[PDB]
Structure formats: C-alpha cells, structure tokens
Structure 1
Amino acid sequence: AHFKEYQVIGRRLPTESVPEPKLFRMRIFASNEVIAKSRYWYFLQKLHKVKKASGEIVSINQINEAHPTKVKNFGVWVRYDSRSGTHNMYKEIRDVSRVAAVETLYQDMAARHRARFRSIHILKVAEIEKTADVKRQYVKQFLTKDLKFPLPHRVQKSTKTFSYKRPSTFY
C-alpha cells in the first residue's frame, strides 16, 4: 500500500539474574503496524539470535517527515535476495518525503527488477544535502538553473462517446 515509517524497539524477555536486556531499535517501512512488527522480528532473528517467542516489543511509533513540503534528493541503498547472494544496489530518488521515495523504489523494483516487497531489503535512505553529490543523470537533469520544459501532445479526456469537433493536442 502507501507506506509509513515506524520505529520498533524490542528486547529479550528478562530472566533470572539478567534484568534490563539490551533494547534494539529498527526503522521499518510498512503499510501498517502488524506488518512492521513482523518485519522487525524477521530482521532481529536474521541478524541476532532472538526469537519472537523469547522476546517482546517494547515500543512502536510512527515517524513523520520533518519537512514534507521540501523537495529533496535521496540516496537509497538496498539489497535483494538472490541465488548468487546479497546484491547491493544504489539508486537516487527525488521526492518530498522518505515514504514517497520508498514507495517509488518498491514500484521501480517491481517494474524493472521484477522484485517483491518480501525480497527487497532497505539498508539506508539518506538525504543528499549538497547537489554536487548527486551522481545519476536522470536526477541531475532536473537540477538545472531556471528549468523550463513543455508538455507536447496534450490528450484531453472525453466524457462523451461522440465529439462534434476534431480534437487538438495543443498546449
């Protein structure tokens, strides 16, 4: 669906002589909190030796974009599950929000790489402060000063089956 970002903080169950186990936080992109918690347990078991049965979720909070009406460039570092192994991929996405950039990235992985949400891992989404660190041409072409472009061949949606006039594509 449309993505939200959550911080999920969990821990092992306290035992005898071991109070206050270490708290682990993870940033998860998901459609809702049930999916977010599921992905968190998946990664915690994949990385450490912690199971959902032996642990608990301490906190889960939605994280909002700080400046959702500011256009930013994002470097996205991902890796996808494969027979040859984990494969790094770096992409650049221009958008106003991290969740919008991640939604674009998932749609793009489905379109080009034929990849699914369960197969894609997000390693890091970072905002590029300076425009000189942008290094993909399909993003750098939109960083030109006084950028103006037209939209040739305008196709207007018709509400009726028949039109009494030949259409125009002018804009």
Structure 2
Amino acid sequence: RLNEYQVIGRNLPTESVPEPKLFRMRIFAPNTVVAKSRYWYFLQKLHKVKKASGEIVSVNIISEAKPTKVKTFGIWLRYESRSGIHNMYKEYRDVTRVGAVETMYQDLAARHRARFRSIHILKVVELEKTDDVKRQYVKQFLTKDLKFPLPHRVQKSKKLFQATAPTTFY
C-alpha cells in the first residue's frame, strides 16, 4: 500500500554556494520515512550529494487529480534480473497513479521475480489518446460497447455444510 510523495532536497549551503539548486523527485513509498530514504538513494545515483551533506526541504503527498476517472497508465521501468539489468515498459488500468504502481509491483514480482529493491520507476504517464495505448492486454478494454459475463461463479459459504446442490450461475 503506497503513496506518491513530492520530496525536495538540496546540498547543504556553503559560504561558497549559499543557495544550492533544489531537486525534486516523485517517490512512490508506503510512508514518509521511506520516501525520504528513496530520495537520497536516487540523488546519489545522479548528483554528488549525500544525506550527511544534504537537507530535506519538503515532503508532500500528491493526490490523484481525478481519483474517480478511469485511466490507462504507461509505466517505464528499469529492473534488475538474476543475470543483468533491463529496461521495460508496461501498461496498467487504474483510477489512481498510485494504484497503477501498486499493480506494477505485484506484476513484476509475479512474472519476473523482481523484488521491490530491483525496480526503478523511470516514468508514469497517463495515456490521453487511445492511440497512445501500445499493449493489447489493456487495449482490449478500450473497445466500444464492452460487455462480458462472469461465468462459473463460486459463492463463499459461511457454513461447512449446505443442504442444496451447488450452482455457478451469474
């Protein structure tokens, strides 16, 4: 269960450089302790800065703009496998940017055994145009007048024994 955070930080000011540039990252983290941790993890991948020599300036939750509008998201990924490092691009259907990232983490764990530590989220983009959708497993839900049943419904029973024959209509 994740949240999207805006984390802003900078190098500690010096008498040589008293206003270092402020850098922001969008972090998908369960809480603010990991959000600031992930921020320093990526800044030391890009900038000559450390947690000891830096300073967190702001941490803010970024809420979904239209949390009850159904969207299609494209997520650009960089993950590590058992053998090498790979770039990937995948698509997810959800109403929140966070819920698409949560689906992504479940998805790469299941099909690629990629743990949370092995994944870099390069970019999350809401696909405005139907032509922007490249993947068929999410493009099949953008067809006109989509209907489908749910055959073979299994009902969960509170009791151990049922006195009537089971059914699966629905």
TM-score category (smaller protein): over 0.9
Name 2:158's counterpart in structure 1. Answer: 159
**8 Å contact kept, 2:80–2:114:** no
* Alignment partners' CA distance in 1, 2:45 and 2:109: 24
**3-state DSSP class of the match of 1:143?**
coil
Superposition CA RMSD, Å: 1.1
Structure 2, unmatched stretches of 5+, are none
Alpha-carbon shift at residue 17 of structure 1 (Å)? 2.9
Moved over 3 A (4+): 82-86
Q: Aligned equivalents of 2:131 and 2:152: distance in 1? A: 34
C-alpha deviation, 1:84, in angstroms = 5.7
Counterpart amino acid of residue 21 in structure 2: K
* TM-score, length basis structure 1: 0.96
Partner of 2:48: 49
1:18-73 deviation digits (Å, cap 9, x = unpaired): 21111010100000000010100010011111011000001111100000000111
The residue number in structure 2 matching 1:64 is: 63
**5+ residue gaps in structure 1?**
none
Paired residues in the alignment total 170
Aligned to 2:30: 31
Normalising by structure 2, report the TM-score. Answer: 0.96
Secondary structure of residue in 1 paired with 2:107: helix
**CA positional deviation for 1:161:** 1.0
Aligned-residue sequence identity (percent) comes to 82
Shift of 1:86: 3.3
* 2:150 counterpart SS class: coil
Helix, strand or coil for the counterpart of 2:55?
strand
Aligned equivalent of 1:143: 142
Alignment-derived partner of residue 107 in structure 2 = 108
Q: What is the DSSP-based 3-state SS (H/G/I as helix, E as strand, rest coil) of the residue aligned with 1:101?
A: helix
Equivalent-residue separation in structure 2 for 1:85 and 1:108 (angstroms): 19
1:13 aligned onto 2:19: no
Quickly say closer, same or farther: Cα 1:47–1:29, change in 2 above 3 A. same
